[PDB]
Amino acid sequence: PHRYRPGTVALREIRRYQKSTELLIRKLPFQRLVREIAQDFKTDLRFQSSAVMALQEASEAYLVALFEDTNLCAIHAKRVTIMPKDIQLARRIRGER
Amino acid sequence: HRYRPGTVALREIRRYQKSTELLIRKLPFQRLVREIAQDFKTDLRFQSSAVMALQEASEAYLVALFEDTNLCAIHAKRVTIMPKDIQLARRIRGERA
Amino acid sequence: KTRKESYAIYVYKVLKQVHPDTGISSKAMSIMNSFVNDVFERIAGEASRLAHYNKRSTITSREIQTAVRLLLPGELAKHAVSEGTKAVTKYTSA
Amino acid sequence: KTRKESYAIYVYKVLKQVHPDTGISSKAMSIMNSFVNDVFERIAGEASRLAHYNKRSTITSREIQTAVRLLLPGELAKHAVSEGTKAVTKYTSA
Amino acid sequence: RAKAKTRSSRAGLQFPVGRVHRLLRKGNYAERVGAGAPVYLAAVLEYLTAEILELAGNAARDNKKTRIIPRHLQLAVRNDEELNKLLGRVTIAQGGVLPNIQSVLLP
Amino acid sequence: RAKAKTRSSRAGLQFPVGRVHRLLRKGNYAERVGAGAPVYLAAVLEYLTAEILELAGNAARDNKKTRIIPRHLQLAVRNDEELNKLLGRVTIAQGGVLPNIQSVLLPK
Amino acid sequence: RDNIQGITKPAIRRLARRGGVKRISGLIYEETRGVLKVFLENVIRDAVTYTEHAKRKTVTAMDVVYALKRQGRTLYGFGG
Amino acid sequence: RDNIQGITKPAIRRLARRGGVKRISGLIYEETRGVLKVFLENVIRDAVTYTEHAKRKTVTAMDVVYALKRQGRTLYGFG
DNA sequence: TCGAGAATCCCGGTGCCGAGGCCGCTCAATTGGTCGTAGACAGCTCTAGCACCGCTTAAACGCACGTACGCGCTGTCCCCCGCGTTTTAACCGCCAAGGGGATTACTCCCTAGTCTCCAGGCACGTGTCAGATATATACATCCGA
DNA sequence: TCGGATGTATATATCTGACACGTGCCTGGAGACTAGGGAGTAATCCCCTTGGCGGTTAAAACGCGGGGGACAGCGCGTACGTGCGTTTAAGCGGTGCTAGAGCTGTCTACGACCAATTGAGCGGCCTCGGCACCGGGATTCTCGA
């Protein structure tokens, strides 16, 4: 029963997903979430496909950058695990809280 | 009589968070501004308002940076402020990033 | 001396509407003038971009209203839209 | 359809000048068009602000040069200023 | 001619509709400017001015002061959730900072 | 008349001086536009396009590809310090990120 | 209508992996969902404002591009 | 001229007390001087660019205000 | 809990300089008519967004184990704080000189505007060759052992 | 320190659809002028910026004792990573419909422009009272018993 140590597959995934450009969120759930959010601003709203694609690209870029900022806060406190406090500190220093 | 090593520091925190004065001496700051400006154009003149605006902006920037730095120090379970906290704040802000 | 216009007169009129006894200083008046100018340029630039996006040559009350909705946060936007609509309705009536 | 213009043939001409053997995709050309429009808008808006600050009603190559100096970083600004000055001199002489 | 009536009086405002119209027409914003745009913009600017001045006057009264100083303007803006959002990248000269000491720093 | 010569031919440019002039004149930037402003702006735009395209073509060559894709443009922009400063608040669609792992996370 | 749970835990783990994150806490996923909801709410509010101004029923890609540019998040490759 | 040393340790300590800092490391002053120097260099470079465009030898407060607004650091109270 | 002792605050006089009010006057906003085109409106058309529908199958979900890490506790010791003395130069009050910011007049050249026209660029149509997609092989790396 | 086994990179077919090229047309940029006003160039005025000096004293620099916080071990419990088996909707490809985005033609009403008129706002001038400053006592926080 071969088993990798905790962290080996994590670094493998880091390299694999930093080497590619694909979208990491499933498209249909994101489209449904976007339509659900937009329902509160206007009813019977229609969306171009490129509009939802642009929204997904922007959201994924924002989340990735926020995770890079969060990792620095985790490392600053002498940790390797990212915690919600690291996200909160990153968003506070950024100016988004 | 002798106050314990934290009392006077808290008193000064309360004192300088209650005032609006400029905390850097004006003549050294003006000399520094002229010295820096020497590298862009020779034989430059400055309005007093220009140096005053520069001092206000610089002091506001430094105070905000020290707030972010204090947050970073508290994140690392410290009460002392350190250069790595300044670097983390400037990296998350996007200045040294 | 040349004539330099500002918003000091109107800011003081509004101040006397709000606090009839409270006064203002020179630096606070400078800050208020800067605030009014900053918000004017923000809203006007947003409206200009809105007109350019839709291929129109005119900046109208619709453009200003949309710019106010885009820029001002939350309840500020709602109250400002109410104020602007009321003013335009009163102006058009008279 | 209607004619929608873009910097597609000019980016391709520049690409053929720089790397004569490679091509470009449609998404990369979309990104290049967006980049050209974004930088055009940045420089033009900076030059417009510069002309407004100095109370001039004309945008000239001096406004463009100063906008380039203010916007572009370091060596980018120097080389872009050199290229623009060369182009203007050649155009005026010709 | 008929006696002149300013557009601000017609709109019921104390901010200049005519000056704002001139600033819009000579600001390189659009080819044309509508007749209700200066009225709307003046109303919005006056509303924002009134909000800030009300909060700043409250701060001045709290500090037992008759006049508004930049400290009172800063106290008004930074203590309002929406005015702090609007003036987020804005520095007010001679305003200082809000009194705020972290809980871990206390004895 | 005479054989018409484009103003991008008199300036030795591959970018349109006439179209840039028209976009400046009809963009609500100033009341008037000078004759050398379109030439200067076209030269600057062409220089920036040429340098980013040179870096992107180098990136495409490193990956053994004959065509530039958004990943190559992102690699070119993020690997150049000045281009990264110029495009620091810009998101390139399908560009991915720059491969980077912190040293404390590496196995040792 | 509970569509925020369609942003699954594996998706957030992938987005963290592209961000260089090795270890993740179990409470990170709810925080990330809240952050994403806030971001999407702001951007979609701006885009729908742009759509309403144009007297349109369909939200176009240009509305999203302008909305993002308003927040200071310029996006290349979708028109502007 | 070492005029960056005119921004003294007590001045930086006062700036830290206004920012809420209770305890300060001994290496904080040189780092703060470096950060201040970089910030001032950026702002002064932009202000001087504005000054030379106007064909002036004097740097005005409006040049500083424009330079700060370019940096995303709008300042109220100087024009 | 309880007193020295120190720091901040809170009342009373001083006086002073900046905010608030007043007065010319000048230019910018108002009023009253044309003009022409920007946009409002009606109609057609024909993309493209939406709503099922069935099949793969890739990905999500749930669970079990254990191991690495987060977190609390303890001790060192040295570095930062508080305080006293000496030294330095910032600051404040004047004084003098002049460089350059700011304003005014004149005129010329440069930009807007119009008509003619024709060629550059855009939409379309088409084919072929980079590249995505299997597939087998060859290594690079990891984890006991 | 060597042997397995797992994951990823490389080299060879092989379709395919998207990119690069060619063609027709049309509309926007170039050529050739004309007209007028923006700005470039002198000149002048006087403001405010720079340089200098002296005395006070506020702040900075230095040093010294000590306490408390940064930091390095050390242990322990748990919660997150890895991997396997089950479930589920995502993705794909086709199908049909029609909502609305987009374009075109009319036409009208609204904003630009212009000329004359006058009053609102701006610069300059006082004046007094709100606040900065000075002094003394009450209040409170701190800290060693």
Residue numbers in the entry:
A (entry chain E): 38 to 134
B (entry chain A): 39 to 135
C (entry chain H), D (entry chain D): 28 to 121
E (entry chain G): 11 to 117
F (entry chain C): 11 to 118
G (entry chain F): 23 to 102
H (entry chain B): 23 to 101
Article passage:
All of the samples incubated for 2 min or longer contained a mixture of several molecular species, including free MPO dimers and free nucleosomes, as well as nucleosomes bound by MPO monomers and dimers, respectively.
Here we show how myeloperoxidase (MPO), a highly expressed neutrophil protein, disassembles nucleosomes, thereby facilitating NET formation, yet also binds stably to NETs extracellularly. We describe how the oligomeric status of MPO governs both outcomes. MPO dimers interact with nucleosomal DNA using one protomer and concurrently dock into the nucleosome acidic patch with the other protomer. On the other hand, MPO monomers stably interact with the nucleosome acidic patch without making concomitant DNA contacts, explaining how monomeric MPO binds to and licences NETs to confer hypohalous acid production in the extracellular space.
